[PDB]
Amino acid sequence: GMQLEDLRQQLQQAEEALVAKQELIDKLKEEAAQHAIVMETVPVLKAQADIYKADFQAERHAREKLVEKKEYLQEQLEQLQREFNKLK
Amino acid sequence: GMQLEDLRQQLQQAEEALVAKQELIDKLKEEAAQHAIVMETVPVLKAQADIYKADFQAERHAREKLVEKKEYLQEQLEQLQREFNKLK
Amino acid sequence: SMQIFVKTLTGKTITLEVEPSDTIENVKAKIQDKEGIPPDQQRLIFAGKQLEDGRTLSDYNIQKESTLHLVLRLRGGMQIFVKTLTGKTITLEVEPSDTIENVKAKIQDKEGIPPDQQRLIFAGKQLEDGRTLSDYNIQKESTLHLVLR
Amino acid sequence: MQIFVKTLTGKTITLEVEPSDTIENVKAKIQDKEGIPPDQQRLIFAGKQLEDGRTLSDYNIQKESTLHLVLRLRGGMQIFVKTLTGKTITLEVEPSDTIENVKAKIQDKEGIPPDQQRLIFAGKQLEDGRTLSDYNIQKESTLHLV
Numbered sequence: 001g002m003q004l005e006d007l008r009q010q011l012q013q014a015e016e017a018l019v020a021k022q023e024l025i026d027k028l029k030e031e032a033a034q035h036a037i038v039m040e041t042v043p044v045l046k047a048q049a050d051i052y053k054a055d056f057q058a059e060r061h062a063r064e065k066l067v068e069k070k071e072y073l074q075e076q077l078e079q080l081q082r083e084f085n086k087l088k
Numbered sequence: 089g090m091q092l093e094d095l096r097q098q099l100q101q102a103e104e105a106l107v108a109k110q111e112l113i114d115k116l117k118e119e120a121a122q123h124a125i126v127m128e129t130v131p132v133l134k135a136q137a138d139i140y141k142a143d144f145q146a147e148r149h150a151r152e153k154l155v156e157k158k159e160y161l162q163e164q165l166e167q168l169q170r171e172f173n174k175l176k
Numbered sequence: 177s178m179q180i181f182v183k184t185l186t187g188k189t190i191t192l193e194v195e196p197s198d199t200i201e202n203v204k205a206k207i208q209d210k211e212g213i214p215p216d217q218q219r220l221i222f223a224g225k226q227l228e229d230g231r232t233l234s235d236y237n238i239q240k241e242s243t244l245h246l247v248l249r250l251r252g253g254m255q256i257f258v259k260t261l262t263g264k265t266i267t268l269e270v271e272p273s274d275t276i277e278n279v280k281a282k283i284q285d286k287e288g289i290p291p292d293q294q295r296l297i298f299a300g301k302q303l304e305d306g307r308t309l310s311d312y313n314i315q316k317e318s319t320l321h322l323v324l325r
Numbered sequence: 326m327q328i329f330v331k332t333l334t335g336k337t338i339t340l341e342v343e344p345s346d347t348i349e350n351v352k353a354k355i356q357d358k359e360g361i362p363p364d365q366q367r368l369i370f371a372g373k374q375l376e377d378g379r380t381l382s383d384y385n386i387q388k389e390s391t392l393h394l395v396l397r398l399r400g401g402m403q404i405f406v407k408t409l410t411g412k413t414i415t416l417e418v419e420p421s422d423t424i425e426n427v428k429a430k431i432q433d434k435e436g437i438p439p440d441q442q443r444l445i446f447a448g449k450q451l452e453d454g455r456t457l458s459d460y461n462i463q464k465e466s467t468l469h470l471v
Contacts, residue, residue, distance in 0.1 A: 007095045014102040021109040028116045035123050042126060043224035044185060044245040045133040051219055052140035055251040056398045059147040060415060066154045067405050068413045071467060073161075075411060131372035132333060132393045137185075139367050143398040144250045148267065150465075155257055156265045159319065 178233075178240035182207060182220075184248065194233060201229035207246065214271055217252035221245040256309075257319040258283060258296075265319070272310040276303050283322065297321035326388035328381075330355065330368075333395065342381065349377040355394070362419050365400040369393035402464040404457070406431055406444070409470060420458035424451050431470070443471035 178196060182203075183189045192206050204215035220227045222236050222244050238244075252269050259265045268282050280291035296303040298312050298320055314320070326344065331337035340354055352363040368375045370384055370392055386392075402420065405413045416430050428439040444451045446460060446468050462468075 004091060004095065007092075007099055011095060011099050011102065014099060014106065018102055018105055018109060021106065021113060025109065025112060025116070028113070028120070031120065032116065032123075035120065035127075038130075039123060039126065040243075040245075041185065042130065042133070044221050044247065045130060045137070047219065047221055047226060048185060048247045049133065049136050049140065051247055051249060052137060052144065053398060055249055056140060056144040056147060059144055059151060059251055060399075063147055063151040063154065064405075064413055064415050066151065066158065067415070067467070068411065070154060070158060071405075071407050071413055072411050075407075129333065132369055132395060135367070135369055135372075135374060135393075136333070136395045139395050139397055141250055146399065148251075152257070152265050152267060155267075155319075156259075156263060159259065159265070160263075 178238075180233075180238065180241070181243040182246050183243055184246050189243075196234040196238070197232055199229065199232050200227045200236075203233075203244075204229070213248070214252055214269070216271070217249040217269070219247040219249065221247065254316045256314060256316065258322050259319055260287075260322050270309060272308070274309045275305070276307060276309075277305045279309070280305070287322075293325050295323045295325040297323065328386065329389060329391040330394055331391060333393075337391075344380065344382045344387075346381050347377060348375045348379060348381075351381075351392075352377070361396070362400045362417075364419075365397045365417075367395045367397060369395065404462065404464070405467040407467055407469045408435065413467070418457060420462070421456055423453065423456055425453045427457065427468075428453075437470070445469045445471065 177193075179191055179193050181189050181191055190207075190210065192203065192210075194203065194206070200220060201215065203220065204218050207213055207218055208215055222238060222242065225236075227236055227244075254270055254272070255267045256270055257265055257267050266286055268279065270279065270282075276296060277291065280294050280296070283289060283294055283296075284291060291305075298314055298318075301312070303312055303320075327339060327341050329337055330340055338358060340351070340358065342351065342354070348368060349363065351368065352366045355361055355366055356363055370386055370390065375384055375392075400417050400419065403415055403417050405415055407413050414431070414434055416427065416434075418427065418430075424444060425439065427444070428442045431437060431442060432439055446462060446466060449460065451460060451468075457466075
């Protein structure tokens with residue numbers, strides 16, 4: 001008898017639970033997509049490190065080559081400074 | 089008589105639907121928490137761009153410092169010559 | 177005849193009108209055309225990956241309203257130097273097609289001196305705002321002289 | 326307490342400390358454990374770079390705290406060894422490094438066995454037992470290799 005009111009009360013309650021858990025889902029998606037787009041910043045931030053490392057390396061090389069030349073030019077001011085004093 | 093059965097097929101359908109809704113909730117949560125771990129590392133990556141850049145600038149000014157000396161000696165080495173090429 | 181977004185890590189989005197057939201290098205050109213950033217100082221990234229100047233947009237699966245990331249190099253390509261009348265020597269980042277205005281601007285970005293107060297010299301000859309670097313055959317690692325106008 | 330320290334690529338080491346400790350002491354404790362020079366280390370907590378002067382208390386860092394470590398591309402002091410050909414290589418150093426360590430570093434980059442290296446810094450033949458600072462070797466100083 002009362003059966004077709006006892007299964008009408010659980011249905012309301014379940015229909016309501018389903019709406020809620022579909023609303024939490026909807027919140028969780030909006031959130032995920034915001035994440036995905038900040039997440040997209042990590043491959044790039046890692047890439048930024050590498051290219052920065054590289055840029056520094058070109059600069060060190062370039063510095064060295066100016067140390068090579070300053071040393072070579074002083075090295076060839078060795079094979080001359082020996083003469084100038086050794087002979088008068 | 090079909091009024092009984094349209095409720096419990098509608099109740100059973102909705103309780104089934106609660107199961108899938110939950111699965112999708114749990115997955116979407118563990119995913120947001122994993123993504124969270126990765127997001128905790130971007131403050132460091134950011135700092136690393138700053139460290140690298142600063143390290144690069146140190147190489148630059150050092151580079152400049154030696155370009156500076158090099159320009160001075162080669163300017164004086166044309167001062168030492170002028171009289172060396174007259175007293176001989 | 178699509179269009180795309182270009183975004184640095186420092187914020188600031190810009191839009192470019194592009195073609196699926198355009199090359200990555202073609203874009204850099206555009207990214208320079210409006211942003212004033214030399215192609216040799218930009219590294220573009222789509223789908224986690226640095227994009228090669230060689231290939232096209234099409235190649236990399238890039239449809240309308242795609243966001244391309246752009247990292248800025250600290251150091252690009254060709255550097256020259258500028259010695260102040262005190263010995264203070266600085267370096268600039270340039271290209272052969274850079275104008276003297278487009279050089280006086282960077283002087284100021286470091287020294288803080290308005291371009292109208294700057295007299296640049298390259299071995300005895302005064303440089304002119306209108307002409308370009310290549311016009312005065314200034315090559316890499318070459319040094320310039322800054323005296324006040 | 327026992328805080329944690331880890332790099333952006335594996336290696337979480339562990340380090341027994343007390344809160345009154347400065348950052349410089351920590352960076353030194355990492356040198357003994359990791360063999361990394363202090364001035365090459367850059368440490369991070371709560372998104373911020375910590376400074377030698379301030380202590381662990383000052384930074385509100387307690388036990389099991391994970392400290393983020395980024396390596397510099399260079400320490401502060403570096404020198405050059407002019408190889409027998411004139412090829413000048415650059416080296417990263419502290420005024421505490423013994424000449425042996427300096428050779429080891431040259432062996433690393435160059436592959437010259439240490440027993441076959443001879444190092445002179447503007448006259449004065451340098452020995453394995455001494456430190457760069459002993460010979461009053463500055464940053465930007467250049468050594469010659471025989």
